[PDB]
Each structure stands twice: as C-alpha cells, then as structure tokens.
Design a protein around this ligand. Structure first.
Ligand SMILES: Nc1ncnc2c1ncn2[C@@H]1O[C@H](CSCC[C@H](N)C(=O)O)[C@@H](O)[C@H]1O
Ligand SMILES: Nc1ncnc2c1ncn2[C@@H]1O[C@H](CSCC[C@H](N)C(=O)O)[C@@H](O)[C@H]1O
Ligand SMILES: O=C(O)[C@@H](O)[C@H](O)c1ccccc1
Ligand SMILES: O=C(O)[C@@H](O)[C@H](O)c1ccccc1
Ligand SMILES: O=C(O)[C@H](O)Cc1ccccc1
Ligand SMILES: O=C(O)[C@H](O)Cc1ccccc1
Ligand SMILES: [Ca+2]
Ligand SMILES: [Ca+2]
Ligand SMILES: [Ca+2]
Ligand SMILES: [Ca+2]
Ligand SMILES: [Fe+3]
Lengths: 338, 333
C-alpha cells in the first residue's frame, strides 16, 4: 500500500496506468479548454457525437479524448454517453495544473534528454507555450490564491487609494480590487507586452480605463522603470506567482530594498507564491509539486523554500506580520509585509 | 470513492505524466541500462560521466521514483518494483513522449475541424526513428525470425518496405550470406542513415536503398531489381496502405511490381475492439488515439484478414505478437 514489492500482473497493470495517465493528463487540459469538463460538471453526463457536432470537432479524436480520461477513472463511458467518474471532481478541481503541465510546459518536459546535457544549456535551450501558460495561470491565480489574497485585503486596516501589482498578467487582480474599492486607481507592471495588451483590453471591457493603467517593466529592477512618477502615491503593493524570479537571494534582497525605496508610501505589501518543498517522500508527492520543482531545475531557475523567504524579508527592508498557507498548491503561501 | 483516495489517484496521474516522459529520457541517456546491469547507480557519478546538469537529473529520477519504477536512497538510485516491466516497454514511452508528445500536447488545437488542413500536427521524426528501432527488435523479431525459419525456401533477393535504419536487411544478410538486399523508404533521412550503416559494416555491395512511397510502389524505379525479389517484408508501416479501397489497390500493385515474390511478411500493430477502458494495456490507447488525431486510418485484425484475397494475396500463416497491443505477422503468398 504504496511502499511494496510485486507480482508480474501487478507490475503490468501499473506500467500500463503510467502510460495511460500520460494521455489522460494531456486530455484534462484539453477537455477543459474545449468545454467538456464544464458540460460534465454542470450536467454530470454528455453525448459524445452531440458534443463533437456542437463544437465542430473531429469526432474519432473526441472519442479518443474521453477514452483517455476513462482509462484512469476520471470519466466512465456508457454507449454513446460519457458520465463523471470517481475521480472527476478532484481532476476537474486541478485541471489548470494539468493544462499548465501539458499544454503549457510539455515541450520542456518532452525534450528532457536534450535539456539535461551541459553542452546544450545556453541561449534559447527550451520552449514554453506562453499563451497556454497564461491561460492556465489565470485560473491557478483565482482558484488557489484568491481565498488568502482576499483574507489579506480584509486584514489591511486601511482603504487603499492607489495599488501597484507586479507581474499583473490578465489584470484580473487589479480589476477585482477596483470592484472592491470604488474610486481606487490601479497600476499593473508586467514584463510581457502580450500581457499588457490583454489587460488594457480586459480593463477597457469592464470600464476601468480611467481607474487602471499598465506598463512594460522588469520588477527585479523597479528603479530602472519609466513610470515611477506614479509610484510615490501607491499605498498598497501586490505580487503573486512571480516572486521566485527575484531570486537568487542577494538579488531578492536588492530587489526588496529597491522596492522599499521605490514605493515609500506603501503600507502593506502582499506577496504570494509557490515554494520548493523539502523532505516529501517520492511516493507521496501531491499534485503540482514535482512538476513545479523539476521544471524549474530543468530551466536552471532558482526556487526558494519557505524558510528562504522567511529569512530574507528583514535584510530586504520589510517585516512579515501575517502569513497564510495555501490549500492544495504544493507548499504555497501569502505573506503580508510592512 | 473517498476524498483521500481521489486525491492520491489524481496526484499519481499528474506524477505519471512526468515519470512517462522520464522513462524515455532515462533510456536515451543511459540510465536504464546502467540500472539493468548493476541494479543501482549513483546520481552524482552518473551525472558526472554523462556531463548532465545534476539537479535536473535528480528530478528525472524523482519522477521515476514517484510511481515505483525506481527507489531513491540518498544520492543513490535502486531498481523499483516496476523497473523490469517499464524498462521492457521503455521504447513505447519514448515513442509516446519524445516522439509523439507534440501531437498529444496540442489536442485542443488538433480536434477542431477548422484547423485540420495542411501541416496541422508535428512529430519529431528523429525521435520516432530512434524508438522504432527498439520497438522493431523487441516486439517483432521473434515472430519475424520464426517466419524466416519457416519460409520453406532460402531467399536470393529480399526487399523491405519502410526499411528505416536498414537493420532488418543487415540481419537478413548476416543469416543469408550473398543474399541481395533492397530497402524502400519514403524518408530521405532513413535512406541516408541506412546507407551509412550498411557501408560502415561492409555490406555495400549487397544492400542498396531507394527512396519511394510503398503506397504507390508501382511508380518507384529500381532499374528492374523488383523482378528479382523472391522475399518481401514490410514491418510497422502497413496500416499506411489504408483505407480499404486504397489497401486493395496497394496490395495489387505490390503483387505486380514483385512478380517473383514467394512470401510477403507483413507485420503491424492493429486497432483493438472492445477492451474495457480500465484494462487497456500499454501502447494500445496511444496508437489508436494518435492515429485518430492525425486523421489516419487504423485497421483491425479482421479488416486485414478480410482484404488480402481481394488484394491478390493469400494468407498462409499468422503469428499473434506478445504484448504490443494486438499485433501480428502475416505471411502472404
Ligand atoms: N521580472 C518580472 N517583472 C514583471 N513581470 C514579470 C516578471 N517575471 C514574470 N513576470 C510576469 O508575471 C506573470 C506571471 S503569471 C502571474 C499572473 C498574476 N500575478 C495573477 O495572479 O493573475 C506574467 O505575466 C509574466 O510576464
Ligand atoms: N508509404 C511509405 N513508403 C515507404 N516507407 C514508408 C512509408 N510510410 C512510412 N515509411 C517508413 O517506414 C518506417 C517506419 S519505422 C519502420 C522501421 C522498420 N520497418 C523496422 O522494422 O525497423 C520509416 O522509415 C518511414 O519513413
Ligand atoms: O515559474 C513560473 O513563473 C511559472 O511556472 C508560472 O507562471 C507559475 C508561477 C507560480 C505558480 C504557478 C505557476
Ligand atoms: O503508426 C506509425 O507509423 C508509428 O506510430 C510507428 O512507426 C509504429 C507503427 C507500428 C507499430 C508500432 C509503432
Ligand atoms: O518569519 C516567518 O515565519 C514569516 O516570514 C512571517 C511571520 C513572522 C511572524 C509572524 C507572522 C508572520
Ligand atoms: O484469415 C486469417 O486468419 C489471416 O488473414 C491469415 C490466415 C488465414 C488462414 C490460414 C492461415 C493464415
Ligand atoms: Ca471507472
Ligand atoms: Ca551505487
Ligand atoms: Ca514514388
Ligand atoms: Ca495490462
Ligand atoms: Fe502510423
């Protein structure tokens, strides 16, 4: 029961499940993106031809997708219908982690044997699908970081007037703050013009054109940023799912110091990220963990543990006054700093 | 059923994705063979010898460990309870991930009818070739050689369709000295590979290669050598002759292009029918699903049994294959 030694028939079944999990795993992401996981969540079942027709999909491949999900118990096939399976709720809950792993990071993991050799580790030595990462990170943010984020907003003690968001992405965080604090002004800062664009768009659509603005920027050197005339007035800083990019340490320490000086009227800084775990046994790794850590190690990108964050704030010029543990995203955390 | 049980199963599915990809890697990088011989290895020592980035190598092995293929004990890796089974099928994992990963990854863009024109999917052909060499050897060789052992004649000229690396023709030359060999492959890369391998081993006089599409074998020129062939072989590509009406015509063209062929050995994997979803063996789902995504017909065994006579051939022997979905070698004449 998880740590054993086995029959030939058992080893056969297990290896086959590894193989099929691979296709299932890729199908969870795709089934989310194509609208099937929603239809099933709402209705508990669906008709595959009907689905393939309504969405104008090559139907043999659609059968293949459901059969892959059925092979490991996420769904159950019955004649022409697919019904939710025993593992539906949990796989649907984590679907964006599957999307992230496959649709987003698949190239990296597939090219494992070209990535690992030193001779190869320079220049553009791996490729991520940026638009798929985005798509997934949008739901990861909402689904995993929202409770703690909102709790931290609730503990602010004050009402912000001007909020800065580092790595703003979709701009959805700034928009929901806008909804929460009528008459606040918001300022996103991403490194990706693609994200800038989608945000300006997503904002205009919601009618927060006057409230919210963005800017191409590298938050690790916030000082060398055209637009730092609006920073002085900001009283709330946020930074979610990008913080590990401040690292390695002395760069994080400097970035934190630069951030302290650049935003001297910031009262609260809210910083959320996933972190590198320690000492979890191989056969008990939960969803996400392995992918996040291994991927970062393949890319050569540093990932701090939680103690590495805790031990850096003072030197960086900030005090941690509240900490929230995140549910179900490896070991992830929100810090409330001042 | 049980929230604890569902969490575990879903985490195993997620980690399985990373282990699957790592099997193919462990194989290609030399780790599986080192664990096969010694039953253990040292990650630091391993990483040093092969000039690998050590943290990525740790992760590679942790992925394997997460699903019981290996066990980690400090900086040292031991064979796990599922090591023999997975090492045995390693080439199928390589095919699925290193070879075909980009197809499955792009399922949301591949399924929509609207995108299904032109070059709508990509495979890594070099990766595929690499896996197919072992798949050929490991799953097909025994039936291949039982068919050779039982031909009822010694061949003088053999042609191999989809000759690939040329390895089949080389082994036939080793068994049958002074047999003449001829490989047909549609890919310039396979031809050049095979040509190098053949000349390198000293088989330059005996075996040649010609680029061509076996589906239209009637248009391939080989300076009248096809008339001389008395044994024909075709492994792991036959499903490409389908759909049905296409296959009939292709089989009739092979019959005309090779009029002195006595036996035609045809080995392939086939589409299965009625396997319950939770009991699907290794390979099956990936073969079937990937061809349905690529828009390529995959026949069942019965479909094949039923096309041969219309195709101008008579099936005289049939060998069931071990442990590659439902695979087969037909001997036709
Ligand atoms: N050094 C840097 N400076 C600014 N943005 C960065 C960055 N490193 C990464 N990013 C951005 O950080 C984002 C990661 S996704 C985070 C999305 C957002 N915080 C949310 O919770 O919804 C991407 O938009 C990426 O371009
Ligand atoms: N229509 C066709 N005509 C000729 N060769 C083909 C083909 N379709 C695929 N192939 C070739 O068939 C090979 C499939 S891999 C098969 C390898 C070989 N028969 C063996 O047993 O090892 C590839 O080299 C590919 O280029
Ligand atoms: O390391 C990253 O930045 C990406 O992997 C991705 O944007 C992400 C960040 C944080 C949590 C989850 C995903
Ligand atoms: O279908 C193909 O041609 C490939 O998927 C692969 O070469 C293969 C064929 C037959 C059996 C096993 C693998
Ligand atoms: O030192 C720590 O563990 C956290 O970074 C922050 C913290 C410290 C004290 C009280 C609350 C939070
Ligand atoms: O019908 C079949 O089984 C196969 O096509 C081949 C076969 C038939 C009869 C005797 C031997 C082989
Ligand atoms: Ca089931
Ligand atoms: Ca050792
Ligand atoms: Ca031709
Ligand atoms: Ca089995
Ligand atoms: Fe094929």
């Amino acid at each position: 029961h998880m740590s054993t030694e086995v029959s030939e028939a058992q080893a056969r079944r297990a290896v086959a499940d590894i193989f099929n999990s691979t296709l299932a795993s890729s199908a969870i992401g795709a089934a989310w993106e194509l609208g099937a996981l929603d239809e099933l969540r709402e209705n508990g079942k669906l008709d595959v031809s009907d689905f393939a027709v309504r969405h104008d999909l090559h139907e043999p491949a659609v059968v293949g997708m459901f059969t892959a999900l059925a092979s490991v118990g996420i769904v159950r096939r019955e004649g022409a219908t697919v019904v939710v399976g025993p593992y539906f709720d949990e796989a649907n809950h984590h679907r964006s982690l599957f999307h992230w792993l496959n649709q987003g990071s698949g190239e990296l993991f597939r090219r494992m044997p070209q990535v690992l050799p030193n001779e190869n580790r320079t220049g553009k030595f791996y490729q991520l699908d940026a638009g798929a990462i985005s798509y997934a990170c949008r739901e990861i943010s909402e689904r995993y970081f929202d409770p703690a984020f909102w709790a931290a907003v609730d503990g602010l003690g004050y009402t912000p007037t001007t909020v800065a968001d580092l790595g703003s992405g979709s701009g959805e965080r700034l928009i929901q703050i806008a909804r929460r604090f009528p008459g606040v002004r918001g300022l996103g800062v991403d490194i990706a013009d693609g994200a800038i664009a989608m945000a300006e768009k997503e904002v205009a659509a919601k009618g927060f054109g006057d409230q919210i603005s963005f800017v191409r920027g590298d938050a690790r050197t916030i000082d060398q940023v055209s637009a730092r005339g609006e920073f002085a007035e900001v009283d709330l800083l946020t930074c979610f799912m990008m913080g590990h990019a401040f690292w390695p340490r002395e760069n994080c320490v400097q970035t934190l110091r630069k951030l302290r000086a650049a935003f001297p009227n910031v009262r609260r800084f809210l910083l959320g990220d996933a972190t590198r775990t320690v000492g979890i046994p191989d056969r008990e790794l939960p969803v996400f963990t392995l992918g996040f850590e291994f991927g970062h190690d393949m890319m050569g990108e540093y990932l701090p543990t939680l103690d590495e964050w805790d031990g850096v704030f003072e030197e960086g010029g900030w005090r941690c006054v509240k900490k929230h543990a995140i549910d179900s995203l490896s070991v992830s955390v929100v810090f409330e700093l001042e």
